[PDB]
């Protein structure tokens, strides 16, 4: 469908061309959190790939560079002092994508140096036979929100570099996460803690990065089991993390989860594209396409007069937030 109207509205409402960052909300008092800015960077990249408007395309090309420059101006070039390994990995993954799109070597160095720091210092086999720690300050839990994004980042690095080290990393992370952070049936657990074990709370963004890593590992290897793993996690999402009418849930008020549909929709588009160009899971592909279209139309129907959609897609039409509002824009820029 049209993703151009939604992307331009999002930029008009939230982009700060002075700081080269998105505002956190329409009160324009604070810029977006560090990790979420990486996900809005990926949204700009997805809209760049989706649009057929050469004017908007050229604007988004410049914006891909600006989002990086604005974050580096505030946080510096070296993010390895951030205690959240997931914050570092969201940026390493965005930087890998920026290189795939542009070939600007600065984005390969940012991706590789941040990925290497996390994988080389935060992968551990002492606890639970594998997995990356959530934090580099304290080691108490290993989480879906670092492990699956790390597998995805390693798969982008393998595509760019052809260095089998990165496919090895992706495979080891994903196999460990499938074993320790899922039920084997498509449900992705939040985390596994040293004292209390697995925490089997499922969320949009952890289903999403699991599906994206499984699809990426299917594309790298040709092994149909990884695509089956992705389809099971997609089916779980469609059958559990929805309301009684099939609309994806609103996961607020938690600020990190409120915009999680953005990451889910990005990765569900990857799966849709792979099913469409392979003839895999034909009955599911048709039902998946109908359910995605239903959700995207519900989101479209929830737009305000400025073409901004808050994250409560099933609810009635205040201050708008860039992370909650990103999910509809992503949904309309599927690649
Ligand atoms: C903790 O994570 C917050 C965020 C991440 O969302 C993000 O990856 C970011 O880069 C880094 O700053 C951290 O909270 C997340 C949400 O926790 C709540 O929901 C879950 C799922 O229902 C629940 O299990 C928790 O108890 C919280 O109620 C969580 O997804 C992360 O794993 C971290 O625990």
Residue numbers in the entry: 39 to 355, 358 to 375
Recite the paper's sentences:
GH76 enzymes catalyse the hydrolysis of α‐1,6‐mannans, such as those found in the yeast cell wall, with net retention of anomeric configuration. In 2015 their 3D structure and putative catalytic itinerary were identified revealing ‐ in the case of the Bacillus circulans enzyme ‐ five enzyme subsites “‐3 to +2” (using the described nomenclature) with Asp124 acting as catalytic nucleophile and Asp125 as catalytic acid/base in a classic Koshland double‐displacement reaction. We show, notably through mass spectrometry and high resolution 3‐D structural analyses, how the disaccharide cyclophellitol is indeed a poor inhibitor, but how the trisaccharide versions, in particular the carbasugar‐stabilised one, potently inhibit B. circulans GH76. We used a more easily crystallizable variant, R341Q, designed to prevent formation of an intermolecular salt bridge due to crystal packing and allow ligand complex formation, but which is otherwise unchanged in catalytic machinery and efficiency.
Disaccharide analogues are rarely the optimal inhibitors for endoglycosidases, but trisaccharide analogues, by virtue of their length, are necessarily also substrates lessening their potential for enzyme inhibition and application. A soak with the trisaccharide 2 revealed a mixture of partially occupied trisaccharides and hydrolysed disaccharide product, with the latter again occupying subsites −3 and −2. The refined structure (whose interpretation was rendered far more facile when subsequently viewed in Iight of the complexes D125 N with 2 and 3, described below) showed low, partial, occupancy by a covalently bound sugar in the −1 subsite with the C1 position refining to approximately 1.55 Å from the OD2 carboxylate oxygen of the nucleophile Asp 124. Further examination of the electron density map calculated after modelling the covalent species revealed the additional presence of an unreacted epoxide in the −1 subsite. Given the clarity of density for an α‐1,6 mannobiose in the −3 and −2 subsites, which was sufficient to allow refinement of fully occupied disaccharide in these sites, the presence of mixed di‐ and partial trisaccharide species clearly highlights the challenges of the unmodified trisaccharide inhibitor on this system.
